[PDB]
Amino acid sequence: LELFIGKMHKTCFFADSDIVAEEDPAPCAFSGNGRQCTANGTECRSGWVGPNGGITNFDNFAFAMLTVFQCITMEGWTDVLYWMNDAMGFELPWVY
Amino acid sequence: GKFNFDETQTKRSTFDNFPQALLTVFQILTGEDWNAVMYDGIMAYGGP
Amino acid sequence: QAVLLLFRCATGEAWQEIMLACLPGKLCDPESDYNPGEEYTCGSNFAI
Amino acid sequence: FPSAVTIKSWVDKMQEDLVTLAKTASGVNQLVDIYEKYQDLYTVEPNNARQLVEIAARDIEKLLSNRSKALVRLALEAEKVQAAHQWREDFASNEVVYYNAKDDEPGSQRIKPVFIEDANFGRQISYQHAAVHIPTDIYEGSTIVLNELNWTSALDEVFKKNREEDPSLLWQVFGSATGLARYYPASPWVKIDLYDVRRRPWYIQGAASPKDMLILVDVSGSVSGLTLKLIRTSVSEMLETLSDDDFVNVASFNSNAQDVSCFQHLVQANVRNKKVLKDAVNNITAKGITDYKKGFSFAFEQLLNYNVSRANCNKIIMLFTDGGEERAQEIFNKYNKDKKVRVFTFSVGQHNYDRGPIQWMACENKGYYYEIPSIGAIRINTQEYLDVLGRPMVLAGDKAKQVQWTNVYLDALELGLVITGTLPVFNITGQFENKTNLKNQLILGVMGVDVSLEDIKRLTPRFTLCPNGYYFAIDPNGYVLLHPNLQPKPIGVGIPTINSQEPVTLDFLDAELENDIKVEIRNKMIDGESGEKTFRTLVKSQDERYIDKGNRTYTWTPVNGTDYSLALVLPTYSFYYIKAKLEETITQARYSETLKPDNFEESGYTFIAPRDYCNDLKISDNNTEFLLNFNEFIDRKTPNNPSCNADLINRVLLDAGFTNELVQNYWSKQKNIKGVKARFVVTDGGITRVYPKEAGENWQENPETYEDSFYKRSLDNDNYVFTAPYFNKSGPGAYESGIMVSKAVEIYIQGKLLKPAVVGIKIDVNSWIENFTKRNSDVMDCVILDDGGFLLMANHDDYTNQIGRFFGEIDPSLMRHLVNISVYAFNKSYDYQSVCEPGAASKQSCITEQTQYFFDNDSKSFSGVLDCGNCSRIFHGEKLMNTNLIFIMVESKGTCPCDTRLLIQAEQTSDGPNPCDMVKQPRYRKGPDVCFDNNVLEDYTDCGGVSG
Ligand SMILES: *[C@@H]1O[C@H](CO)[C@@H](O[C@@H]2O[C@H](CO)[C@@H](O[C@@H]3O[C@H](CO)[C@@H](O[C@@H]4O[C@H](CO)[C@@H](O)[C@H](O)[C@H]4NC(C)=O)[C@H](O)[C@H]3NC(C)=O)[C@H](O)[C@H]2NC(C)=O)[C@H](O)[C@H]1NC(C)=O
Ligand SMILES: *[C@@H]1O[C@H](CO)[C@@H](O[C@@H]2O[C@H](CO)[C@@H](O[C@@H]3O[C@H](CO)[C@@H](O)[C@H](O)[C@H]3NC(C)=O)[C@H](O)[C@H]2NC(C)=O)[C@H](O)[C@H]1NC(C)=O
Ligand SMILES: *[C@@H]1O[C@H](CO)[C@@H](O[C@@H]2O[C@H](CO)[C@@H](O)[C@H](O)[C@H]2NC(C)=O)[C@H](O)[C@H]1NC(C)=O
Ligand SMILES: *[C@@H]1O[C@H](CO)[C@@H](O[C@@H]2O[C@H](CO)[C@@H](O)[C@H](O)[C@H]2NC(C)=O)[C@H](O)[C@H]1NC(C)=O
Ligand SMILES: *[C@@H]1O[C@H](CO)[C@@H](O[C@@H]2O[C@H](CO)[C@@H](O)[C@H](O)[C@H]2NC(C)=O)[C@H](O)[C@H]1NC(C)=O
Ligand SMILES: *[C@@H]1O[C@H](CO)[C@@H](O)[C@H](O)[C@H]1NC(C)=O
Ligand SMILES: [Ca+2]
Ligand SMILES: [Ca+2]
């Protein structure tokens, strides 16, 4: 909840529209550190709902607790690790 | 009969009939893709 | 990255998918010094 | 406020200041003298409406008989060739050679043609062979296609033979039941390609008869999810296989059967009605339990109505469900015991329910069963129901080989507006001994030959008629096959709200202004009976801004070969026309020398109508090189005219001298006039001349005389016509153009009225203003309006800056009151062929509502008080004599600070009329009298399940 809250909310839509570019959307960098969506014409901005439809996120205590429990069972934890690699940088999320 | 919400694809791990419910429960018991079934169960009652 | 991938396979996440993705008929990044003409060469049958 | 006598005397001083200037500067009386002082250079010939109608209707019938003979010659050969096929199942060695369209092989060899560019064909074509089109989703080289790809190669010889007899022949296409279309002459195919020959309107009408379809949609609980999105898409694609001769309705059942729309019964299933059904189908939801007994009873009751117009033909119930355990045997037993209604059942979606009852329903009622598990199967499975419907047609024999013509539609190969002949092709293999009879109940394909509307407009020459006279042809459904108002654009429905496959079906009552007398003429023309009637009509102008009333005479006869009816619109003063008779050389050399561009200094800047005076001389649609092309053609060509005609060349040359005598002998004498800025003459020959060559660059009118709005408007009126300029800086029209004035010349050769031309001047707005003041008063307003409520001058400068604008957009309060006191009448119309900017949910087609205003009462003096609340404005209105103008004097709008909503007279994007109450009282129509259904020899022993 402290390290990363509300960071999986920036995917790359089309230029001046509300349609996501890629079929399996992934977050951009929060502030110019992680993934940069570089296509012909694209830009990413806040407004996305979330990776798994909003279920998988650390922007609430219940959501964070459910995601932590999911990651402990060793089922779909690399997905969250990769989503943090995309949203945040690349050296902090691997420790968590 | 509550996984018919996507309107673009058909779900295979459902609770439609008794054999499919048994297979889904067994799959969750083995732990493989239990979170995928949980996400569908949550989205069937609204969402996040 | 290799150690992290090995840890991912040790926890058993999608190791068979990675094994399939490491098969012979795979393209190579345009940075390795590979003979011109044949790009889809890297990848080996030793992955299994 | 001045009294009534003072205002009227004030008008008569200015009213005569305009008529006199327009009568002398333009020289309307002198052109009468010129047209009357010879009476030897031409002759007045009768213009009989009854003869022209019967002559043009016989040429159209002959043209459609040439194509009918071409279809019979093709259909017979295709049946003969296919009957001699062996169905070889290997083509590795005996490879088939053909030209595949849309290209830059197991058993196929491609062909590289030459593709020489040709006229009367907007593409590059080759007569050496015939092209073959294979849709994307159909694999070429398969056993079925390759076998089909031999016996169609013998059609190329007949394709060549038909063209040799009639060089003026358009596409001849064979639409195979397998999917491939072979057309001649070969031409490369025109994003991705989704064209399928089996879904085209011309193929569908020939593969079966009109049908009374009724779509039953399962909206129960179990269909919720993906399998409902497949049902809604399947119904939408199914409605696209219906034409104007088909009657359809959509109903849904979930423990209770009800209609999904507002129709409540079968409707004509035209573009307007199909859009409503499609919109309602895309808004259904899944909930409840399934009840087949109640669903089918509701469907069987709607097919027994007979209260309204139907097709009285194939009656089919098309069920869209997933699967169930109810068979509803009692319902089928009670309603259709004698199998008068077919039932086609569809099992849609990825499910595991019982398909047993669904399959049993299909062929217990002479139907067929289909699987639609995904989107990719929607396109193909929703068009295969025509194979079952075609069984009674093939068993009829040679009595079903009748040529039919489709509605007007845009060609797939970018050729324009065309119609297609239709003739089916049968499987007659083994019929010489009559032993197979198993697959011989399916059509091989459909024969097609295209006829462009330009070919039909050529058989109805309109240049011996006045510009107000025209021909028009009608469909038994009421749509116009021929009309001046018909345009090569798809007809739109509703407002396009976004975040050309349909036919151009424009009804006769929608092509022009609808009247209570046109309806009885339309009905008399639909059922094919000759007649005539003279009556008074109010006519919309070429530009949708003015409505003028004048006498018209409609003469119609039915085309005997086809079901079309041809009518000739011909007003009064058009029963005679000028025919030039002159063959001497030196009397034509002087006339031709007037059209020299270098002689424009004294003869005025001269235009020419881009008419086909002579084949060779092509048209350029710019009137810059065409005049140079035309005048360098007449001198460099023998006068005997071996090819084209001299009637269209003598008339234009004769009027060249007539206008020369006016510009030289009268217009040159008065070189400059204080109030005259330009002087123009427009003649029936097709030349327009403006004396000031510096003012010839301000001419914006169409070079063709017959397309000039002011020319047609001037003929109807017996007085001078004032045309307001356009607004919003649409080119130079504010001050450097002037206000156009026109007046038609009237001559009496032997007591027969003729109107060969019009003349007029362009009154300068600057000089007229001073005459108006003899200024910017804050108490009273002095404005002048024309017939249509368009401002021509005012008395406040700022109003003058916005010139040629509807008076309702600059003073709504007074304009709205003028309509109520019966000074300005108005009728609204609908423009189905129009394009507009899309609205919130480039440009797309839409329906735009058009309104025009005209003088209602014949009274000339108007007085009254405009009460806008807690104030009072009094006005006096006087109409100028021998002119379509009105002068009204009113106080300033600042005296009473009230401003209602501005009254708009412009292209307003609408969606009317509402079709929910149109189907209650539909227009009269007549359908085909041939029906092919319920044949006792039909097999129908394959339900949907013996193959799966
Ligand atoms: C016009 O009608 C005539 C007959 O009225 C029709 O000619 C008939 O064509 C069919 C092919 O559709 C021939 O059928 C033969 O027998 C079977 C039926 O398919 C084929 O054997 C295999 O059948 C399976 C289906 O179960 C199929 O998937 C497979 O591809 C077939 N071939 C294999 C396994 O090699 C035969 O191959 C097929 N052809 C033969 C034996 O030559 C009929 O024999 C034809 N009848 C006659 C009298 O010629 C003709 O196609 C119709 N016109 C058109 C345009 O279709
Ligand atoms: C389907 O395709 C087949 C392969 O192209 C065609 O079969 C061949 O057509 C050729 C052209 O007529 C024949 O060539 C000559 O045929 C005449 C008539 O019988 C004879 O003089 C000889 O057979 C032959 N002449 C030679 C070889 O000098 C082939 O005989 C014929 N058969 C083969 C190649 O096996 C079919 O005609 C075609 N079907 C249709 C309806 O066009
Ligand atoms: C269409 O055919 C009918 C008859 O088949 C033609 O009717 C003719 O009408 C005239 C009167 O105007 C009679 O003198 C003729 O005797 C009629 N014909 C026959 C065969 O009796 C009709 O004129 C034809 N219409 C066209 C446009 O050709
Ligand atoms: C029109 O449809 C109605 C109902 O579908 C038919 O039934 C009659 O309707 C009229 C007016 O409503 C009345 O006579 C009776 O209510 C109905 N029954 C009978 C026996 O007449 C009707 O026959 C159809 N045709 C017409 C011309 O109304
Ligand atoms: C077009 O002209 C006027 C426009 O207002 C209308 O014709 C009048 O309609 C009123 C409405 O009841 C009648 O009382 C008048 O008698 C009509 N005037 C006539 C017939 O001269 C109408 O909108 C249109 N006229 C048509 C369709 O005939
Ligand atoms: C085709 O039509 C023309 C006129 O429409 C006619 O003269 C001719 O006889 C018809 N037939 C042929 C084969 O040209
Ligand atoms: Ca796992
Ligand atoms: Ca059901």
CSV table of N, CA and C in Angstrom, one decimal, chain B residues 1 4-10, chain D residues 222 224-226 228-229 232 350:
chain,number,residue,atom,x,y,z
B,1,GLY,N,-24.7,-20.7,-14.1
B,1,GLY,CA,-25.2,-19.8,-15.2
B,1,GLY,C,-25.0,-18.4,-15.0
B,4,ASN,N,-21.9,-16.0,-18.1
B,4,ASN,CA,-22.2,-15.5,-19.5
B,4,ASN,C,-22.3,-14.0,-19.4
B,5,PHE,N,-21.2,-13.3,-19.1
B,5,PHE,CA,-21.1,-11.9,-19.1
B,5,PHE,C,-20.1,-11.3,-20.1
B,6,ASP,N,-19.1,-12.1,-20.6
B,6,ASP,CA,-18.1,-11.5,-21.5
B,6,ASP,C,-18.7,-11.1,-22.8
B,7,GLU,N,-19.6,-11.9,-23.4
B,7,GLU,CA,-20.3,-11.7,-24.6
B,7,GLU,C,-19.4,-11.7,-25.8
B,8,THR,N,-18.1,-12.1,-25.6
B,8,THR,CA,-17.1,-12.2,-26.7
B,8,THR,C,-16.4,-13.6,-26.7
B,9,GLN,N,-16.5,-14.4,-25.6
B,9,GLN,CA,-15.8,-15.7,-25.6
B,9,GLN,C,-16.6,-16.6,-24.6
B,10,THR,N,-16.4,-17.9,-24.8
B,10,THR,CA,-17.0,-18.9,-23.9
B,10,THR,C,-16.1,-19.4,-22.9
D,222,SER,N,-31.6,-18.8,-21.4
D,222,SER,CA,-30.4,-19.6,-21.8
D,222,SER,C,-29.7,-19.0,-22.9
D,224,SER,N,-28.7,-15.9,-23.1
D,224,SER,CA,-27.9,-14.7,-22.7
D,224,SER,C,-26.4,-15.0,-22.9
D,225,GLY,N,-25.7,-13.9,-23.2
D,225,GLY,CA,-24.2,-14.1,-23.3
D,225,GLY,C,-23.7,-14.0,-24.8
D,226,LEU,N,-22.8,-14.8,-25.1
D,226,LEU,CA,-22.2,-14.8,-26.5
D,226,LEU,C,-23.3,-15.2,-27.5
D,228,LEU,N,-26.3,-14.7,-27.7
D,228,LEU,CA,-27.3,-13.7,-28.1
D,228,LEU,C,-26.7,-12.7,-29.1
D,229,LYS,N,-25.4,-12.4,-28.9
D,229,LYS,CA,-24.7,-11.5,-29.8
D,229,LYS,C,-24.6,-12.2,-31.2
D,232,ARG,N,-28.3,-11.8,-32.7
D,232,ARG,CA,-28.6,-10.4,-33.2
D,232,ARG,C,-27.8,-10.1,-34.5
D,350,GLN,N,-22.3,-21.7,-29.0
D,350,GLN,CA,-21.5,-22.8,-28.5
D,350,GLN,C,-22.3,-23.3,-27.3
